[PDB]
Short mmCIF file of C-alpha atoms and ligand atoms in Angstrom, two decimals:
data_model
loop_
_atom_site.label_atom_id
_atom_site.label_comp_id
_atom_site.label_asym_id
_atom_site.label_seq_id
_atom_site.Cartn_x
_atom_site.Cartn_y
_atom_site.Cartn_z
CA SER A 1 272.84 71.14 -249.56
CA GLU A 2 271.24 67.59 -249.57
CA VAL A 3 267.79 67.03 -247.83
CA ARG A 4 267.93 64.34 -245.04
CA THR A 5 264.81 63.21 -243.01
CA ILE A 6 263.98 60.77 -240.13
CA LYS A 7 260.67 59.31 -238.86
CA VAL A 8 259.58 60.38 -235.32
CA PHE A 9 256.38 60.08 -233.24
CA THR A 10 254.58 63.22 -231.97
CA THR A 11 252.03 63.11 -229.11
CA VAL A 12 250.53 65.00 -226.11
CA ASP A 13 249.28 62.03 -223.94
CA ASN A 14 252.07 59.52 -224.89
CA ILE A 15 248.97 57.39 -225.77
CA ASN A 16 248.00 58.70 -229.29
CA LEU A 17 251.30 58.77 -231.28
CA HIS A 18 251.21 60.54 -234.70
CA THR A 19 254.04 59.51 -237.10
CA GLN A 20 255.90 62.58 -238.46
CA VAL A 21 258.83 63.18 -240.89
CA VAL A 22 261.49 65.71 -239.73
CA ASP A 23 263.96 67.71 -241.91
CA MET A 24 267.41 67.21 -240.27
CA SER A 25 268.28 70.69 -241.85
CA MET A 26 265.73 72.45 -239.55
CA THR A 27 265.22 72.46 -235.74
CA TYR A 28 262.31 70.75 -233.90
CA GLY A 29 260.96 74.21 -232.92
CA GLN A 30 260.78 75.55 -236.51
CA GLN A 31 258.54 72.70 -237.82
CA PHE A 32 256.64 71.53 -234.68
CA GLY A 33 256.59 74.53 -232.29
CA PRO A 34 257.78 73.81 -228.69
CA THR A 35 259.03 70.15 -228.71
CA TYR A 36 260.31 67.99 -225.77
CA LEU A 37 262.05 64.55 -225.63
CA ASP A 38 261.84 62.88 -222.12
CA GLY A 39 260.93 66.34 -220.66
CA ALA A 40 264.03 67.93 -222.29
CA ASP A 41 263.45 71.00 -224.50
CA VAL A 42 264.49 70.25 -228.14
CA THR A 43 262.71 73.32 -229.64
CA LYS A 44 266.09 74.76 -230.81
CA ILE A 45 267.77 71.35 -231.36
CA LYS A 46 268.20 69.95 -234.93
CA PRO A 47 267.23 66.22 -235.25
CA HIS A 48 269.78 63.35 -234.79
CA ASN A 49 269.81 59.77 -236.29
CA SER A 50 269.34 58.33 -232.71
CA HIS A 51 266.00 60.30 -232.44
CA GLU A 52 264.39 58.28 -235.31
CA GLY A 53 261.40 56.23 -234.00
CA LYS A 54 261.46 58.04 -230.59
CA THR A 55 258.42 59.82 -229.07
CA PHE A 56 258.34 63.67 -228.83
CA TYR A 57 255.80 65.82 -226.87
CA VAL A 58 254.42 68.87 -228.84
CA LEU A 59 251.98 71.78 -228.13
CA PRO A 60 248.41 71.36 -229.45
CA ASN A 61 248.31 73.54 -232.63
CA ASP A 62 245.45 71.55 -234.37
CA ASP A 63 242.05 70.45 -232.93
CA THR A 64 242.96 66.68 -232.73
CA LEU A 65 245.73 67.48 -230.16
CA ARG A 66 243.64 70.21 -228.37
CA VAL A 67 241.01 67.51 -227.61
CA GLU A 68 243.42 64.54 -226.89
CA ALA A 69 245.25 66.92 -224.43
CA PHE A 70 242.14 68.25 -222.53
CA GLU A 71 240.84 64.62 -222.29
CA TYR A 72 244.19 63.49 -220.69
CA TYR A 73 245.17 66.59 -218.57
CA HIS A 74 241.58 67.94 -217.96
CA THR A 75 243.12 71.49 -218.47
CA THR A 76 243.19 73.80 -221.56
CA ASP A 77 245.86 76.16 -220.10
CA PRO A 78 248.61 76.50 -222.82
CA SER A 79 251.56 76.81 -220.35
CA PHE A 80 250.67 73.52 -218.56
CA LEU A 81 252.26 71.17 -221.16
CA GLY A 82 255.57 73.11 -221.02
CA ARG A 83 255.65 73.14 -217.17
CA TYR A 84 254.98 69.34 -217.02
CA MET A 85 257.95 68.66 -219.38
CA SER A 86 260.11 71.34 -217.67
CA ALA A 87 259.49 69.56 -214.31
CA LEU A 88 259.69 65.94 -215.65
CA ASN A 89 263.20 66.81 -217.08
CA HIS A 90 264.36 67.18 -213.42
CA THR A 91 262.05 64.61 -211.67
CA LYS A 92 263.30 61.79 -213.98
CA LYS A 93 266.79 62.30 -212.34
CA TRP A 94 265.49 61.83 -208.70
CA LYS A 95 265.81 58.34 -207.03
CA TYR A 96 262.56 56.67 -205.80
CA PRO A 97 263.49 53.94 -203.29
CA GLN A 98 260.90 51.50 -201.78
CA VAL A 99 260.99 52.64 -198.07
CA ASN A 100 258.81 50.55 -195.65
CA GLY A 101 257.11 48.97 -198.76
CA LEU A 102 255.98 52.45 -199.97
CA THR A 103 257.44 54.47 -202.91
CA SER A 104 259.50 57.50 -201.68
CA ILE A 105 261.88 60.16 -203.12
CA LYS A 106 265.59 60.61 -202.21
CA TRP A 107 265.84 64.26 -200.98
CA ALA A 108 266.75 66.66 -203.87
CA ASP A 109 265.46 70.11 -205.10
CA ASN A 110 263.35 70.54 -201.89
CA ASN A 111 261.24 67.49 -202.89
CA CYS A 112 260.47 66.79 -199.14
CA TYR A 113 256.79 67.99 -199.38
CA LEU A 114 256.33 65.85 -202.58
CA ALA A 115 257.77 62.65 -200.98
CA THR A 116 255.37 63.17 -197.98
CA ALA A 117 252.30 63.81 -200.19
CA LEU A 118 253.21 60.71 -202.35
CA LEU A 119 253.86 58.42 -199.33
CA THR A 120 250.42 59.85 -198.21
CA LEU A 121 248.55 59.27 -201.56
CA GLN A 122 249.68 55.53 -201.45
CA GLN A 123 247.85 55.10 -198.08
CA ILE A 124 244.43 56.74 -198.94
CA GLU A 125 241.61 56.03 -201.47
CA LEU A 126 241.97 58.75 -204.17
CA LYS A 127 240.24 58.31 -207.57
CA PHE A 128 241.93 60.72 -210.07
CA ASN A 129 239.64 62.51 -212.62
CA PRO A 130 242.40 63.31 -215.21
CA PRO A 131 243.83 60.10 -216.81
CA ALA A 132 247.36 61.66 -216.72
CA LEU A 133 247.15 61.55 -212.86
CA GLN A 134 245.64 57.96 -212.75
CA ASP A 135 248.20 56.47 -215.22
CA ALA A 136 251.16 58.17 -213.41
CA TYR A 137 249.90 57.30 -209.85
CA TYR A 138 249.72 53.54 -210.72
CA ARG A 139 253.26 53.78 -212.25
CA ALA A 140 254.25 55.70 -209.04
CA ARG A 141 252.98 52.84 -206.74
CA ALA A 142 255.30 50.50 -208.75
CA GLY A 143 258.35 52.86 -208.26
CA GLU A 144 258.51 54.90 -211.54
CA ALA A 145 257.27 58.10 -209.74
CA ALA A 146 258.99 60.67 -212.03
CA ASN A 147 255.85 61.38 -214.20
CA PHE A 148 253.55 61.64 -211.12
CA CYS A 149 255.86 64.04 -209.19
CA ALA A 150 256.12 66.05 -212.48
CA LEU A 151 252.28 66.27 -212.93
CA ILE A 152 251.91 67.31 -209.22
CA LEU A 153 254.31 70.32 -209.74
CA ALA A 154 252.50 71.22 -213.05
CA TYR A 155 248.98 71.04 -211.49
CA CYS A 156 250.14 72.87 -208.30
CA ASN A 157 251.89 75.65 -210.35
CA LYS A 158 255.22 74.87 -208.58
CA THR A 159 258.77 74.57 -210.04
CA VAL A 160 261.58 72.08 -209.17
CA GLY A 161 263.69 73.27 -206.19
CA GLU A 162 260.85 75.29 -204.58
CA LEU A 163 259.44 74.08 -201.18
CA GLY A 164 255.60 73.68 -201.00
CA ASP A 165 252.90 73.32 -198.24
CA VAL A 166 251.87 69.60 -198.06
CA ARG A 167 248.28 70.79 -197.29
CA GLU A 168 248.15 73.35 -200.26
CA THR A 169 249.42 70.44 -202.52
CA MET A 170 246.76 67.91 -201.28
CA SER A 171 244.04 70.66 -201.53
CA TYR A 172 245.08 70.89 -205.26
CA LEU A 173 245.26 67.08 -205.85
CA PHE A 174 241.72 66.72 -204.27
CA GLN A 175 240.47 69.38 -206.78
CA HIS A 176 241.36 66.66 -209.37
CA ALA A 177 239.93 63.63 -207.51
CA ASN A 178 236.42 62.11 -207.21
CA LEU A 179 235.29 63.37 -203.75
CA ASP A 180 231.79 64.58 -204.81
CA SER A 181 230.11 61.84 -202.67
CA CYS A 182 231.98 62.96 -199.48
CA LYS A 183 229.76 64.86 -196.98
CA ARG A 184 230.50 66.61 -193.61
CA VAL A 185 227.89 68.00 -191.13
CA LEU A 186 229.15 70.45 -188.43
CA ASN A 187 227.09 71.81 -185.50
CA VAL A 188 228.32 75.12 -183.97
CA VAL A 189 226.79 76.01 -180.56
CA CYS A 190 227.06 79.50 -178.96
CA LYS A 191 225.15 80.08 -175.68
CA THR A 192 224.01 83.61 -176.70
CA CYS A 193 223.68 82.84 -180.48
CA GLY A 194 222.16 79.32 -180.56
CA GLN A 195 223.00 76.39 -182.93
CA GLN A 196 224.00 76.34 -186.65
CA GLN A 197 224.43 73.10 -188.69
CA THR A 198 226.73 73.25 -191.78
CA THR A 199 227.01 70.64 -194.60
CA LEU A 200 230.23 70.55 -196.71
CA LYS A 201 230.56 68.58 -200.01
CA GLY A 202 233.72 67.62 -201.98
CA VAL A 203 237.19 68.82 -200.86
CA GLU A 204 235.76 70.99 -198.00
CA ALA A 205 234.20 67.83 -196.50
CA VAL A 206 237.65 66.08 -195.85
CA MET A 207 239.94 69.04 -194.86
CA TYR A 208 239.92 70.94 -191.51
CA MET A 209 242.47 73.59 -190.37
CA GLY A 210 242.96 74.43 -186.64
CA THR A 211 242.96 70.96 -184.98
CA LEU A 212 245.02 67.75 -185.60
CA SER A 213 242.88 65.46 -183.35
CA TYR A 214 240.04 63.80 -185.31
CA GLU A 215 239.04 62.83 -181.73
CA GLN A 216 238.94 66.49 -180.49
CA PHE A 217 237.01 67.54 -183.65
CA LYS A 218 234.31 64.91 -182.88
CA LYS A 219 234.19 66.07 -179.19
CA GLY A 220 234.12 69.74 -180.32
CA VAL A 221 236.69 72.58 -180.56
CA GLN A 222 236.63 76.21 -179.30
CA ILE A 223 236.25 78.83 -182.11
CA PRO A 224 235.51 82.61 -181.77
CA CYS A 225 231.89 83.82 -182.33
CA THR A 226 230.42 87.14 -183.65
CA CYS A 227 229.13 88.21 -180.15
CA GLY A 228 232.66 87.79 -178.63
CA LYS A 229 231.76 84.67 -176.60
CA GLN A 230 233.53 81.40 -177.58
CA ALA A 231 231.54 78.80 -179.59
CA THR A 232 231.87 74.98 -179.84
CA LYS A 233 232.18 73.32 -183.31
CA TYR A 234 231.79 69.48 -183.29
CA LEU A 235 231.58 66.88 -186.12
CA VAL A 236 227.92 65.66 -186.54
CA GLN A 237 228.51 63.39 -189.62
CA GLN A 238 231.49 62.37 -191.86
CA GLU A 239 230.82 60.54 -195.19
CA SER A 240 234.30 60.11 -196.79
CA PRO A 241 237.05 57.51 -197.38
CA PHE A 242 239.33 59.58 -195.02
CA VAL A 243 239.57 63.02 -193.29
CA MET A 244 242.55 65.44 -193.29
CA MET A 245 243.16 67.35 -190.01
CA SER A 246 245.61 70.28 -190.31
CA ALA A 247 247.01 72.93 -187.91
CA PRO A 248 250.13 75.18 -187.67
CA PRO A 249 253.07 72.94 -186.56
CA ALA A 250 253.20 72.28 -182.78
CA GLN A 251 254.55 69.54 -180.44
CA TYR A 252 252.24 66.50 -180.90
CA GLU A 253 252.44 62.82 -179.78
CA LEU A 254 251.13 60.24 -182.34
CA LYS A 255 250.36 56.85 -180.64
CA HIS A 256 250.51 53.73 -182.94
CA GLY A 257 247.06 52.72 -184.33
CA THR A 258 245.10 56.03 -183.76
CA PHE A 259 245.91 57.59 -187.20
CA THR A 260 246.84 56.45 -190.77
CA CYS A 261 249.75 58.86 -191.46
CA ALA A 262 251.09 62.37 -190.56
CA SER A 263 253.24 65.28 -191.96
CA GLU A 264 255.85 66.45 -189.36
CA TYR A 265 257.31 69.90 -190.15
CA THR A 266 260.45 71.23 -188.38
CA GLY A 267 261.73 74.76 -189.18
CA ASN A 268 260.36 78.26 -189.94
CA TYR A 269 257.46 79.07 -192.34
CA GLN A 270 258.32 78.27 -196.04
CA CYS A 271 261.90 77.08 -195.21
CA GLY A 272 261.39 73.95 -193.02
CA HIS A 273 261.87 70.19 -193.66
CA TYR A 274 259.02 67.59 -193.94
CA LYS A 275 258.94 64.00 -192.59
CA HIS A 276 256.20 61.36 -193.11
CA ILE A 277 255.17 59.28 -190.04
CA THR A 278 253.08 56.23 -191.15
CA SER A 279 251.16 54.05 -188.59
CA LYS A 280 251.55 50.29 -189.35
CA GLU A 281 252.49 47.45 -186.91
CA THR A 282 254.65 50.08 -185.09
CA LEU A 283 255.40 53.74 -186.11
CA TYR A 284 257.63 54.38 -189.20
CA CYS A 285 259.27 57.80 -189.82
CA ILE A 286 259.99 57.98 -193.60
CA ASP A 287 262.29 61.00 -194.13
CA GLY A 288 263.24 61.10 -197.82
CA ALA A 289 265.04 57.75 -198.31
CA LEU A 290 265.93 57.47 -194.58
CA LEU A 291 263.81 55.43 -192.10
CA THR A 292 263.55 55.22 -188.26
CA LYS A 293 261.12 53.21 -186.10
CA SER A 294 259.45 54.21 -182.76
CA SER A 295 256.43 52.92 -180.70
CA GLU A 296 255.40 56.61 -180.08
CA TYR A 297 256.39 59.87 -181.90
CA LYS A 298 256.74 63.35 -180.32
CA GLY A 299 257.40 65.99 -183.04
CA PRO A 300 255.98 69.19 -184.60
CA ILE A 301 253.02 67.81 -186.65
CA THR A 302 250.94 70.05 -188.97
CA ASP A 303 248.96 67.37 -190.93
CA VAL A 304 247.30 64.11 -189.70
CA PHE A 305 245.19 61.80 -191.95
CA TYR A 306 242.56 59.30 -190.64
CA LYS A 307 240.68 56.61 -192.67
CA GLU A 308 236.85 56.72 -192.42
CA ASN A 309 233.57 55.47 -193.91
CA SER A 310 230.42 56.98 -192.30
CA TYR A 311 230.43 58.62 -188.82
CA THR A 312 227.30 59.83 -186.93
CA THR A 313 227.64 61.79 -183.63
CA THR A 314 225.88 60.51 -180.45
CA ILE A 315 225.73 64.09 -179.01
CA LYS A 316 222.16 65.33 -178.18
C1 XR8 B 1 256.49 74.81 -196.60
C2 XR8 B 1 255.56 75.95 -197.13
C3 XR8 B 1 255.61 76.25 -198.44
C4 XR8 B 1 254.82 77.21 -198.96
C5 XR8 B 1 253.91 77.92 -198.17
N1 XR8 B 1 253.17 78.97 -198.98
C6 XR8 B 1 251.84 79.49 -198.81
C7 XR8 B 1 250.76 78.53 -198.54
N2 XR8 B 1 250.31 78.77 -199.93
C8 XR8 B 1 251.29 79.83 -200.15
C9 XR8 B 1 253.86 77.63 -196.80
C10 XR8 B 1 254.68 76.62 -196.26
C11 XR8 B 1 254.80 76.14 -194.73
O1 XR8 B 1 255.73 76.56 -194.10
N3 XR8 B 1 253.91 75.11 -194.10
C12 XR8 B 1 254.06 74.67 -192.72
C13 XR8 B 1 253.35 73.34 -192.48
C14 XR8 B 1 253.55 75.83 -191.83
C15 XR8 B 1 252.28 76.39 -192.06
C16 XR8 B 1 251.87 77.47 -191.29
C17 XR8 B 1 252.71 77.99 -190.31
C18 XR8 B 1 254.00 77.47 -190.13
C19 XR8 B 1 254.92 78.07 -189.03
C20 XR8 B 1 254.95 79.39 -188.49
C21 XR8 B 1 256.03 79.46 -187.36
C22 XR8 B 1 256.66 78.18 -187.20
C23 XR8 B 1 257.76 77.75 -186.17
N4 XR8 B 1 257.24 77.00 -185.35
C24 XR8 B 1 257.32 75.42 -185.63
C25 XR8 B 1 257.22 74.78 -184.46
C26 XR8 B 1 257.22 75.81 -183.39
C27 XR8 B 1 257.52 77.17 -184.10
S1 XR8 B 1 256.04 77.13 -188.31
C28 XR8 B 1 254.40 76.37 -190.86
ZN1 ZN B 2 227.62 83.94 -180.44
#
């Protein structure tokens, strides 16, 4: 038979493109290893004339790509590149409407927790350590959210169609954000035991589970103690751009102006539906691509986010 070839671009960051020549006789997988075009596996697909000049994602098999990859993704896990493409292949087919001047996702493949988290990430000051996340986030804010949503799944070890905890997802995204400066000082007072001051840095400094009221946390909350008597934990000092207050879903009333945004969760554990309530001039319930407006909001709320700079307690 006759030998035909085409010119294609190979890359791992879609930033450093390496020109390559492909034998139309052979498949992409035989000569490049796992290969993906727009997140679609082409490892067992022979090249087409239309493919010439197009960009193709490949697995790092030489040291140039090993580096370029780690520098972009900040991970050296081999499976990560495949999972990002696997995901992206689906997330490029979602619809991302501007809802209340924020990018959102039309409900599909249980994307409700992702929509919420994304609507959330557009309202708080997050500086992303991996370029991949930065580049995608910016392109998300503009409305092309496919790549972002796809990196979130990849970094959270989740697959399209599977429902996720909004809090477990933010925990993960904060692992990959610059929150080193953030500081939290907690005093815990037990009448028998005495006092104990705790300082938390990074992700632990902006996430609390067991109370949704930033107000109640400052006042102090009841927690069990070693001696069996109850103890009071209150916020001494918060140095962060925001704080995340989480609790198991329960009836809560968000008043306009007291919070930045909230995750409402209706349904049983691991099978419920998520809505995003954002506080602006009035209250805005962003539920996938749908939108309702109230002055107040009574619903089961598991996550509430508040903006912050530096807070010092006046107690004692
Ligand atoms: C959606 C989801 C996905 C995955 C996971 N996986 C584990 C976390 N890492 C692995 C968790 C959840 C979850 O469901 N979270 C909600 C907020 C949540 C988290 C914790 C507990 C609950 C509830 C227990 C009983 C409920 C019914 N309630 C709702 C209102 C009144 C009765 S909801 C709900
Ligand atoms: Zn005690």
